[PDB]
């Protein structure tokens with residue numbers, strides 16, 4: 001009966017809509033929801049540090065009335081001195097949710113199968129579903145309804161943002177295109193899962209090496225750091241590519257950006273950019289996710 | 298008032314320990330009902346060697362008392378190196394309402410407590426682990442009722458911090474404590490003598506034996522712990538062969554009273570000092586025991602702050 | 606207009622007086638001001654860790670109702686995987702103020718020029734203005750009115766405390782003397798800025814190698830460690846030049862009979878200051894360390910209200 005969020009498709013289309021509505025409500029009234037008043041605890045655990053992820057979760061948990069107990073790298077990695085299952089059993093006595101940044105999906109699934117509190121994938125090798133919640137919140141702010149929009153992601157199509165934009169995007173009814181060079185394409189099982197979910201929402205999945213075609217008529221253009229660099233240079237999100245999009249298109253980028261590589265100063269700082277609101281919305285979207293999971297768990 | 302500290306289990310009298318354990322039960326029921334640190338007031342939580350489990354328990358506990366834990370971990374300069382211990386104690390006493398400290402030798406705790414003008418708590422040290430034993434006693438009371446006259450046997454390294462604190466804290470509660478350990482691994486004589494003296498006041502007793510089977514027979518509570526701390530991994534000894542007869546396994550548990558429970562300061566090394574079958578069976582109380590660090594430490598802080 | 610506090614003279618004499626008054630009020634009533642109720646966040650960022658700085662800000666922010674998000678030097682250094690300007694713009698969405706311990710003053714300037722929330726220098730290579738606020742709070746507690754007092758600093762005359770005592774001291778109307786060996790004198794730009802500020806307040810600036818003359822008649826004697834961690838490999842003998850400038854009992858006896866002694870902790874007993882001075886009745890170092898809490902909270906309250 002305990003709900004987890006390890007990958008974007010763990011929410012149904014209707015559930016994702018609820019979380020995104022909650023994110024908009026919490027952005028307007030950031031201390032109106034206090035499910036963790038007490039304070040109650042939430043564990044925020046990093047096998048590898050991610051300062052931006054820790055910052056967003058730590059403040060968000062505090063604004064829900066709770067106390068984040070943060071476990072950094074440098075500390076004993078989880079599972080090193082104790083079985084994962086033993087640690088999960090005790091954690092479930094101390095905190096009301098477990099937020100975890102680890103690498104393989106195997107470890108996340110193992111924790112979710114045993115823990116009796118919700119487990120959230122803060123960021124992993126395969127998915128980055130909290131950032132895509134924030135992306136979807138950002139798109140809804142700038143454009144309104146998500147269903148039927150065209151979103152193109154450019155660059156490394158095998159990384160966690162590509163996978164999550166596929167799954168999270170089609171869950172929202174967005175037609176998702178991944179524009180990537182050969183050998184950096186989506187994981188085939190992720191692509192299949194997105195194609196299947198798209199059948200329910202009227203969305204679609206496209207994977208192409210043609211950056212021009214992916215930009216043409218796009219409503220949302222996304223990229224992410226590339227880490228040779230040489231296969232990705234034709235996919236740089238520059239002014240020439242942006243000029244092909246639909247009017248009022250917006251540009252997203254999980255920060256940090258490497259200006260001059262995957263994205264140019266002119267695109268980052270121009271009027272289509274929504275990267276600053278997008279970064280802020282990690283706070284609101286993650287708070288919404290926690291509120292929603294806690295209420296069901 | 299005199300400033301009260303908690304550096305070893307017998308720093309509380311039997312009556313005082315009963316007061317803390319009663320408060321721990323009350324706080325488990327109503328975890329935000331005591332707010333002596335509302336403000337927030339600060340509490341320093343200092344680690345000469347990091348302990349994530351100890352940190353979770355104190356950080357959350359202090360917050361649930363209304364306070365803010367300021368954590369200093371081993372990445373900072375170790376206390377006493379860039380600044381004298383006495384200088385640090387003086388300034389800490391201006392910033393925080395209590396000092397929680399995980400360190401090594403007991404003389405450091407003593408030095409801090411002699412000069413600090415706020416309560417000092419031993420979070421975990423080489424010689425004692427008195428906060429875990431408060432949680433242990435809370436767990437035993439939950440599972441079995443009155444502590445006085447129970448029989449508790451600890452198995453393994455009889456000179457580690459858990460053996461010492463189970464001796465002192467157990468006999469303070471009126472529990473007859475047995476330590477089952479191989480030769481060369483017996484409790485420190487000064488601790489053993491202190492436990493024997495305290496046991497006279499409570500009607501308890503202290504027993505030290507190498508006969509694991511005899512220690513298990515008739516026991517109400519069986520306890521073990523890892524055989525080797527991190528600081529002993531390079532001590533030169535074979536720290537497996539001596540301890541194998543003291544493993545807390547199903548055969549040993551079956552010698553005890555039919556209603557006996559099992560305790561273990563986590564983490565456990567399954568297959569060494571304890572088996573899966575015992576950890577995961579119905580006698581195991583190790584999960585509640587770990588949770589109860591939260592409640593017992595909150596009770597200790599509330600009690601020390603009120604008396605100081 | 607967003608106000609920053611990157612160096613001591615970012616506050617006018619009148620503004621400094623307002624902050625120090627607020628520090629005294631907060632010391633009396635430490636949880637009466639809640640501008641960060643929510644909690645709202647405050648970023649506390651360390652390019653090089655300082656446990657005492659982090660300890661005092663983290664608790665102070667909590668007592669203002671906020672939540673300090675501490676970024677240690679274990680994170681990628683600010684400006685390396687992202688431009689400083691980009692990080693500033695996102696931080697302004699997350700927190701109501703940015704407290705930063707960094708190295709060169711140009712980095713602080715760069716952050717303040719683009720951030721839309723107040724930026725505070727927690728401690729830097731050139732200045733330590735938050736500690737000097739705590740010092741002025743401490744002097745006021747022990748001595749009363751600050752105007753006209755005579756303060757002498759001894760030791761490395763070009764470190765952050767020397768610079769901030771010059772700027773913060775003359776802002777308060779204090780006659781500041783820096784006693785230091787040749788080669789270790791205040792930055793010329795800082796000395797000139799202090800000299801100009803002193804003309805507004807009736808204060809004065811003196812730099813001398815004559816430690817005995819600097820101590821004579823002084824109301825406050827200050828010293829600091831002779832070497833920061835970053836100077837340990839600079840090639841200099843950083844002991845022998847400073848020995849004549851040791852704050853010892855002989856030097857203290859030259860000052861006014863009611864003089865007090867300050868030292869940013871930690872101190873190295875036996876080097877820049879002696880046990881007899883640290884532990885005697887003139888020492889104010891313990892109150893001084895505590896007042897980091899109150900003075901920093903006051904600065905935050907004041908900057909948040911004005912910005």
Ligand SMILES: Oc1cccc2ccccc12
Nearest residue numbers: 045071076077078349350
């Ligand atoms: O990563 C860890 C190592 C050891 C103990 C832990 C307890 C809770 C959460 C994380 C832990």
Ligand SMILES: Oc1cccc2ccccc12
Nearest residue numbers: 087090091350353563587
């Ligand atoms: O074993 C553990 C795992 C995670 C958290 C803990 C807290 C206290 C005591 C033990 C713990």
Ligand SMILES: Oc1cccc2ccccc12
Nearest residue numbers: 369373374375376656657
């Ligand atoms: O261990 C330490 C090193 C440096 C500063 C400290 C301040 C408080 C408590 C502990 C400290």
Ligand SMILES: Oc1cccc2ccccc12
Nearest residue numbers: 385388389657660870894
């Ligand atoms: O010296 C110290 C020891 C412990 C805590 C401190 C906090 C602020 C300033 C100095 C401190």
Ligand SMILES: Oc1cccc2ccccc12
Nearest residue numbers: 051052676680681682683
């Ligand atoms: O230093 C940093 C590295 C990466 C991310 C950061 C976010 C906020 C403040 C500082 C940061």
Ligand SMILES: Oc1cccc2ccccc12
Nearest residue numbers: 052055255279692695696
């Ligand atoms: O890029 C950043 C700089 C500072 C803070 C951040 C927090 C969340 C996401 C991104 C951030």
